[PDB]
Amino acid sequence: DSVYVQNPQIPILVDRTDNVLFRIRIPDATKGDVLNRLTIRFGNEDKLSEVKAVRLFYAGTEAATKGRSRFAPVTYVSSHNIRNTRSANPSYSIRQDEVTTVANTLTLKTRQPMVKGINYFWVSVEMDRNTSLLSKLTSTVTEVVINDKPAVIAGEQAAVRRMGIGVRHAGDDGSASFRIPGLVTTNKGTLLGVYDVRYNNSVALQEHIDVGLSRSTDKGQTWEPMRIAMSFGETDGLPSGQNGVGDPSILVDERTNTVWVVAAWTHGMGNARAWTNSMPGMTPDETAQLMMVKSTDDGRTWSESTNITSQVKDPSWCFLLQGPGRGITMRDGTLVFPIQFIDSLRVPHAGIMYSKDRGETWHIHQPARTNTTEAQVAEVEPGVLMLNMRDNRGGSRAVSITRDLGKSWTEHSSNRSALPESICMASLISVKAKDNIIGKDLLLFSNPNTTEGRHHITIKASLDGGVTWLPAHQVLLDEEDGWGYSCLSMIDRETVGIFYESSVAHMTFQAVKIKDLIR
Amino acid sequence: DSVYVQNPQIPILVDRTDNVLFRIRIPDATKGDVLNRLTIRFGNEDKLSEVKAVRLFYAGTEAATKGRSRFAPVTYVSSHNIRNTRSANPSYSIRQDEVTTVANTLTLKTRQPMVKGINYFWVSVEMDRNTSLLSKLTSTVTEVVINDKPAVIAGEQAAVRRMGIGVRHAGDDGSASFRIPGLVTTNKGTLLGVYDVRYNNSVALQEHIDVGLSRSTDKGQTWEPMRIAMSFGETDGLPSGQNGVGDPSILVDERTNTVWVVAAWTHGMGNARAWTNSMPGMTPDETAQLMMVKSTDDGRTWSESTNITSQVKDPSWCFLLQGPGRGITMRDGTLVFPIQFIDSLRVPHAGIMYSKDRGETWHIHQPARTNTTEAQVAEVEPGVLMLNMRDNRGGSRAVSITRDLGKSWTEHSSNRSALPESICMASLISVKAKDNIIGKDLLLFSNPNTTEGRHHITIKASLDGGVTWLPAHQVLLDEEDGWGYSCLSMIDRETVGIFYESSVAHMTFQAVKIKDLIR
Ligand SMILES: CC(=O)N[C@@H]1[C@@H]([C@H](O)[C@H](O)CO)O[C@@](OC[C@H]2O[C@@H](O[C@H]([C@H](O)[C@@H](O)C=O)[C@H](O)CO)[C@H](O)[C@@H](O)[C@H]2O)(C(=O)O)C[C@@H]1O
Ligand SMILES: CC(=O)N[C@@H]1[C@@H]([C@H](O)[C@H](O)CO)O[C@@](OC[C@H]2O[C@@H](O[C@H]([C@H](O)[C@@H](O)C=O)[C@H](O)CO)[C@H](O)[C@@H](O)[C@H]2O)(C(=O)O)C[C@@H]1O
């Protein structure tokens, strides 16, 4: 009979006990058939001394109504189960074999009698906790033996597998979930990742939500314990569940290395979504408040929050907040945070908010585009800001240019064409020629590369200021289902970091060589 | 202004830290208004020595879009949060005052400045863990002072509150949820309650599900630690997630005091629902299997499972299983378990399965009615079996009679008329005249007393063999939302037990005097 193999392009987490290397479907088994041996081969230059162990699991059969093309009956390693996100659910997968000394050829064994029809097995890889985030595996199933006969192998399994690290898992420090990533590199090379700490569940404001921060001084190989960057606990004697703060955006003031976090504080509003329940006005009791904290010590400690609402919110707006992810420093020292507001008629608009005085005062001019929400901004050329926007019309990112900090806007050539989306947050950054190994100005963009669902998390690079995104200049990181938000920061001259919601952890960090993007 | 009070008809659990006694809405507060004190009065005959503590909580305000007639913005005490089902979520409710020695008059205070518009407070009652299940509280909010003026109190708050006990809470013994209650009284007066232990989540078979059992030798004041009555773990080397057993039904063989549990074992079927994925055949690999265990020691220990599929399942049926809840012993010693089968055309039918030989052999004859599922059976008069059925047409219970153990069936006068339902499991039992204090044959019925959703869990009594269910002969136990399944058993001559899925715990036990049903 014929055997099918999948090598899923998902991150192998260095901090996990189990990671799916291969999924295998045996579609047409006779009752009693036994998978005696499976052989995997790794590429000659793979660093197999970083592989702690490889495992073969059996996961039984398929439901009668689910057809014959799936590679599994269920998620093998959960990213949501607060009681276990790090190993295979033992109730879905039974270990058959384990090898703890991994060579270029590897054989795994089973004595499990198969059921009639579909049978599922899969290969777990466990990595050394100190595995280089830049390391890659090129693994293939080369032989599968059933009843002492080699079987015909089919399936696309030629993926070059990448490493990652689960910075936050569901359930960490008692929190149900973590959402809405932001990432910057400080002037010291320190990585700062921000996110919602969603304690009770995974719904947005209003709820019990604080802004968490994870700090790495070693390019993401290690992360310090979670800091609360921003929190309103029981302000004015209202429950913490009616005092949430979230959808954070973080920037480094590149002139001072002062780090800024802006977030939306909801005060009251029962247990309902702020998106529909934030109302016109200015006071905390009336409307969502635009709040900021700062760190003068490379993200170790955080100021008390300052309320910036009165400086920038039109009273008639239902809701003003930051675009989640990150802000920028411009070449002339202006600090810029993307923003979004819901007007009196409940129409959302993306725009920008800027400070020319090191974050003392903030200003908003004109919206970029009707019916847009979350946006990220890059200085594509000197004094020239590119706004890349989530568009409620569906299908594709909106792209506008301002050269007057949003007093006026022009559509970009790439607007509503060049970058597919499913209506989801996306990351965009600029990289100066002198600041990277290619020696050319780059734009780097990340989002779920699809018009439906949130999957195929992809980094794209542009060499012509975001006019063109050539297919060759793209790295697929995560082809499976997630919440889809992502944020990019250059780690060093050679490597871009991505902090994102993945199929494998709520907050996932990966590092990618620029030379893999632009060959 | 004007203040609104709710006294919700939900069980006060003796094992909980918090129970909602009163919910209060202050609809039209001015910013800064303060609830200086509210006074509660308890009835003259209340056993206040059993009240451990009373608490006043503030829960903030309401969402602008959610209207002005709710009594809360959120569930105050969760029945689903595996991390806490026993106390108020501290993120939704802030304690204002607390009294730990309770008199007939009681004053609670706050210094919380209210927000403009809607403000929510509520009163928690905590009972001594040894509080009598038969105790009742008659409590009223008699005074509410705001800015040192008495306010006008409105609302229905005259409810006579009853006690109950949370036998199983979400998260107990590591299990995500508990569902599908069954209850019997052994010849020794011992209460035996069965249920699905749904480890991973709350979905039906197929999943990692065992049959749990809780035992009480003191009329439900105490429950012995959970026993696994039936389990298939990793049978044939298939995951425990593809070896679930559930939807249990329990009966006591009144002649021998041998206790029987029947359940559906699903083997394989991926991670999909057995209702649509169980297929024709006879083997465990082919179709859901009918399994039975027994206890000869009053439910302390349980036999290994016997497979009775071959005796009673037509090969062409997609799915044969017990009707969840309980079976009976007839006056002539016949053991009867309600059953249901899905035929070759996917049409479900309710019927009965019986043993005349102490459970050695089982027989099924003819279905009672097309497009029915879960049913419970009672011997309403000698040799006369009433089958009460969940009906997919909606709105009302189907009721049929057999005098020949299901060879033939007659429609009852009460069919599709007398008993409202929303398509949900219901409990029906018979009580002999000599076996209860009323000295008359009773039928007792429990279900969610509604045509939409699952709420208003109500015990109903009939004096005329289920022809008439007079409104006067009904007790409302739970007016809030739950999963709706229930099972009745007489505890003694004077009191009926109900083991049910409630708004306050996955498995809830309450005891009700017959004299409260029939006055
Ligand atoms: C302040 C604010 O509301 N926050 C942001 C919202 C924002 O509402 C929109 O940009 C406005 O148009 O976008 C996000 O959440 C809102 C959506 O959540 C959906 O449910 C899940 C759920 O986010 C997840 O957490 C499971 O629990 C997802 O669809 C994931 O696929 C709901 O269908 C809607 O409420 C839907 O509006 C988003 O993810 O897009 C996250 C962000 O915080
Ligand atoms: C063997 C078997 O399947 N078992 C029983 C099924 C059975 O399928 C039906 O009697 C046959 O027609 O009935 C139960 O589930 C069937 C429904 O469950 C509903 O979801 C309820 C929720 O109570 C809902 O009603 C909100 O109020 C859950 O609690 C979810 O966790 C689904 O929404 C339906 O689509 C539907 O699938 C039931 O509870 O009725 C559970 C029982 O074990």
Reported as type and span, the H/E element at residue A510 is strand A507-513
- HEC secondary structure over A460-490: EEECCCCCCCCHHHEEEEECCCCCCCEEEEE
Q: Is B374 a catalytic residue?
A: yes
Among A322, A344, A200, A315, smallest CA distance to A265 is for A322
Contact B89 A200 (CB under 8 A): yes
After which residues does chain B become discontinuous at a C–N distance over 2.5 Å? none
Q: Which residue in B has a C-alpha nearest to residue A32's C-alpha?
A: B236
Are B36 and B109 in contact by the 8 Å Cβ rule? The answer is yes
The pairing of beta strand A474-478 with beta strand A457-462: antiparallel
Q: What angle do CA B438, B440, B443 make, to 5 degrees?
A: 100
Phi, psi values for residue A181, rounded to 5°: -70, 140
Looking at the complex, report in whole angstroms how far the Cα of residue A277 sits from the nearest Cα belonging to chain B: 6
The encoded tokens of residue B191 equal: 């209460």
Instruction: Report the separation in Å between the CA atom of B9 and the middle of ligand 2, taken as the mean of its atom positions.
Output: 25
Task: Say whether residue A110 is in contact with chain B using an 8 A CB cutoff.
Answer: no
Matching residue, tokens 């952890």: A505
Q: What are the angstrom distances between the C-alpha of B422 and each of B389, B449, B483?
A: 12, 8, 12
Alpha-carbon distance B275 to B291, whole Å?
17
Nearest to A73 among B62, B65, B271 (CB): B271
Residue type, B363: H
Contact A73 B115 (CB under 8 A): no
Of B277, B342, B483, B486, which is best to mutate to test ligand 2, by the most ligand atoms within 8 angstroms of its C-beta? B483
- SS3 category, B388: strand
- SS3 category, A309: helix
Domain ranges across chain B: 1-160, 161-519
Among B426, B72, B253, smallest CA distance to A241 is for B72
Are A170 and A501 in contact by the 8 Å Cβ rule? The answer is no
Q: Which atom of ligand 2 is nearest to the CA of B275?
A: 3
Q: What angle do CA A272, A278, A283 make, to 5 degrees?
A: 125
Contact A241 B112 (CB under 8 A): no
Looking at the complex, report in whole angstroms how far the Cα of residue A200 sits from the nearest Cα belonging to chain B: 9
Contacts of A240 in chain B (CB under 8 A): 90-91
Looking at the complex, report in whole angstroms how far the Cα of residue A357 sits from the nearest Cα belonging to chain B: 36
Reported as type and span, the H/E element at residue A274 is helix A274-277
DSSP string across A45-86 = T--GGGEEEEEEEE-----TTS-S--S-SS-SS-SS-TT-SS
A374, A379, A421, A501: the catalytic one is A374
Alpha-carbon distance A4 to A374, whole Å?
41
Phi-psi region of A117 (alpha: psi -120 to 50; beta: other; left: phi over 0): left
Please count the other Cβ atoms lying within 10 Å of the Cβ belonging to residue A206: 28
Are B209 and B231 in contact by the 8 Å Cβ rule? The answer is no
Are A126 and A19 in contact by the 8 Å Cβ rule? The answer is yes
Among A455, A476, A449, smallest CA distance to A159 is for A476
> CA quadruple A412, A414, A416, A420: dihedral positive or negative?
negative
Are A421 and A451 in contact by the 8 Å Cβ rule? The answer is yes
